[PDB]
């Protein structure tokens, strides 16, 4: 699927993360330290640039995300 750098295209934008179990666009591991990107999670589904299918994993992810409340690389609404 997508590579590590894909999310770099959404600097200061909002995307939609759709949780899947099979065939994701990105395998995502959520971490509290040393992420590839900082993501702010939103409570609103509006103004999402694009839908990215993510599968949450605990080992060997395509990308590591750290949830933050302020100063994120991008925003994501999860469903």
From Swiss-Prot:
Family to which the UniProt record says this protein belongs: To Synechocystis PCC 6803 slr1025.
Name assigned to this protein: Uncharacterized protein UU089.1
Organism for this UniProt entry: Ureaplasma parvum serovar 3 (strain ATCC 700970)
